Design an enzyme around this catalytic site. Structure first.
Site, short mmCIF file in Angstrom:
data_model
loop_
_atom_site.label_atom_id
_atom_site.label_comp_id
_atom_site.label_asym_id
_atom_site.label_seq_id
_atom_site.Cartn_x
_atom_site.Cartn_y
_atom_site.Cartn_z
N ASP A 48 -21.85 16.85 -33.16
CA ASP A 48 -22.24 15.45 -33.36
C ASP A 48 -22.10 15.02 -34.82
OD1 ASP A 48 -23.03 12.90 -32.50
OD2 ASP A 48 -25.15 13.35 -32.58
N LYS B 158 -21.10 12.96 -38.01
CA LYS B 158 -20.92 11.55 -38.27
C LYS B 158 -21.64 11.19 -39.55
CE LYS B 158 -24.83 10.65 -35.14
NZ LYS B 158 -25.52 9.81 -34.08
N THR C 91 -22.03 11.17 -30.32
CA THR C 91 -21.96 9.73 -30.54
C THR C 91 -20.58 9.17 -30.20
OG1 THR C 91 -23.67 9.95 -32.21
CG2 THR C 91 -22.40 7.86 -32.22
#
Ligand SMILES: O=c1nc[nH]c2ccccc12
Length: 277
Positions: free
Chosen positions: A133, A135, A164
């Site tokens: 994940d 980001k 996401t």
């Protein structure tokens, strides 16, 4: 080792972040005056929603990390209702905050922060760990403006979950399978976002974003640094085995040798002074 710490050892302050299963609160340890970011999780809610494996895996992955570009887990304790994880406090907040504040990064800042992220992924992947994940929201900045990658609840340890939407790799949408090369796809989205100011796959809702990702439907602004565009094209590749950095492309050496990184000294980035943003 020191006796277990407890809630009374700290003075709790402001909330730093809130999730569905946890809250992170800034805390000052009374005996030392040290500040920690304490992640607090309610045992009842975790059990109810079947999150024990995730909470267990997050703790276990964090215990294994010992590198300046990652969150550090200092201590854990619990009381009747709650688990407490003592983490390094990243005083400058999220990379996403700086993206928004300044719009988009010039080439020197893009290069430097991209190099820190690549160097962190090399360490993480060398341990057989996948983030899943990655980001700008979980790439934090310390007081010295070096990165500190966090949020390992969803990590996977190599011998289900979907991160996401804007950063999801095509293989997750077409197989429910992840691998190191999924982090590299996210890296390609992040670089693009540093340079353009926005992530590459955008649309009105998740379904439409997913459609664009599996069709490789995005494009580059005219003002995109050419060498950075070449790198992003070599990372956003539908075929996961053809992404620069993956094992089938012979790993991090060729990634780190990409011309975008020509002037980078890889060996001691943490010791270097970051370009002002
Ligand atoms: O400051 C932090 N250090 C580690 N993890 C975090 C997660 C959320 C908010 C802040 C932090």
């Amino acid at each position: 080792q020191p006796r277990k710490k407890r809630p009374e050892d700290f003075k709790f302050g402001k909330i730093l972040g809130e999730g569905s299963f946890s809250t992170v609160v800034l805390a000052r340890e009374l005996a030392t005056s040290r500040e920690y970011a304490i992640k607090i999780l309610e045992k009842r809610h975790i059990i109810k929603e079947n999150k024990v494996p995730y909470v267990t895996r997050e703790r276990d992955v964090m215990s294994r990390l010992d590198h300046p570009f990652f969150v550090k887990l200092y201590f854990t304790f619990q009381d009747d209702e709650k688990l407490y994880f003592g983490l390094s406090y990243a005083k400058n907040g999220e990379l996403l905050k700086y993206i928004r504040k300044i719009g988009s990064f010039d080439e020197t800042c893009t290069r430097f922060y991209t190099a820190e992220i690549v160097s962190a992924l090399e360490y993480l992947h060398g341990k057989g760990i996948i983030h899943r994940d990655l980001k700008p929201e979980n790439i934090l900045l310390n007081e010295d403006m070096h990165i500190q990658i966090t949020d390992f609840g969803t990590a996977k340890v190599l011998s289900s979950f979907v991160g996401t939407a804007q950063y999801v790799s095509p293989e997750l949408l077409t197989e429910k399978s992840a691998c190191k090369s999924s982090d590299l796809w996210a890296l390609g989205c992040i670089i693009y976002q540093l340079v353009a100011g926005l992530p590459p796959f955008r649309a009105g809702n998740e379904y439409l974003i997913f459609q664009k990702i599996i069709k490789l439907e995005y494009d580059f602004p005219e003002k995109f640094f050419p060498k950075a565009r070449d790198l992003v094209e070599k990372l956003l590749v539908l075929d996961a085995t053809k992404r620069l950095g993956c094992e089938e492309m012979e790993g991090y050496g060729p990634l780190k040798a990409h011309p975008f990184f020509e002037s980078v000294t890889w060996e001691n980035l943490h010791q270097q002074t970051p370009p002002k943003l």
